Design a binder for this molecule. Structure first.
Ligand SMILES: [Mg+2]
Length: 196
């Protein structure tokens, strides 16, 4: 039930933030936030986040991109695929006042249970196989070229790669403004609703 024709698949660490996941996944702040399952528990960490090295934060341009693309919902959907913890991802979005109500997060699992973001290829294949997903525009951003190809390979495996834009850049080097132009240039109904 529903139609999703245009999907933006985003890695989190090093893509939306300025730090590759290897240098954050085991950090005290990421471990502390991992178990914080409510807004109230997460928000207590905002001060420590704000005092953190700027590399770990959501970058200014990624924040603006997420906020802009959120306004294109439901014509465009955002899917975050990450080996990091769901509650760390939600916390950072909340710290930056980014609404995540409609963003789908495929994160690491809890404990010994494996989560969907631990296998990016399978995460994309599973998402494309949902009955509401239809062919159309695909944007994929990852700072790990291998990971990025894993998500690309998932689109290929499902026959959903006819109109893909794939961006692999070093953290802090993503051209989110250009990617927003790419969405609007390739999603007719998106740009029709955007013009009010
Ligand atoms: Mg990454």
């Amino acid at each position: 039930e529903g139609r999703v024709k245009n999907i933006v698949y985003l890695n989190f660490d090093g893509t939306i933030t300025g730090a590759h996941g290897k240098e954050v996944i085991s950090s005290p702040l990421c471990e502390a936030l991992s178990t914080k399952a409510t807004f109230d528990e997460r928000m207590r960490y905002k001060n420590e986040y704000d005092a953190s090295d700027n590399k770990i934060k959501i970058t200014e341009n990624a924040k603006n991109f997420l906020q802009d693309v959120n306004k294109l919902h439901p014509q465009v959907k955002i899917v975050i695929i990450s080996r990091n913890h769901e509650n760390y991802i939600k916390a950072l979005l909340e710290f930056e006042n980014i609404d995540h109500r409609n963003i789908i997060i495929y994160p690491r699992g809890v404990g010994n249970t494996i989560g969907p973001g631990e296998d990016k290829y399978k995460a994309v294949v599973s998402h494309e196989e949902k009955p509401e997903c239809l062919p159309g525009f695909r944007l994929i951003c990852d700072d790990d070229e291998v990971d990025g190809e894993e998500m690309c390979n998932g689109l290929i495996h499902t026959g959903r790669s006819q109109l893909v834009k794939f961006h692999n850049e070093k953290p802090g080097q993503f051209k989110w403004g250009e990617y927003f132009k790419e969405i609007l240039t390739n999603c007719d109904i998106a740009v029709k609703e955007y013009l009010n």
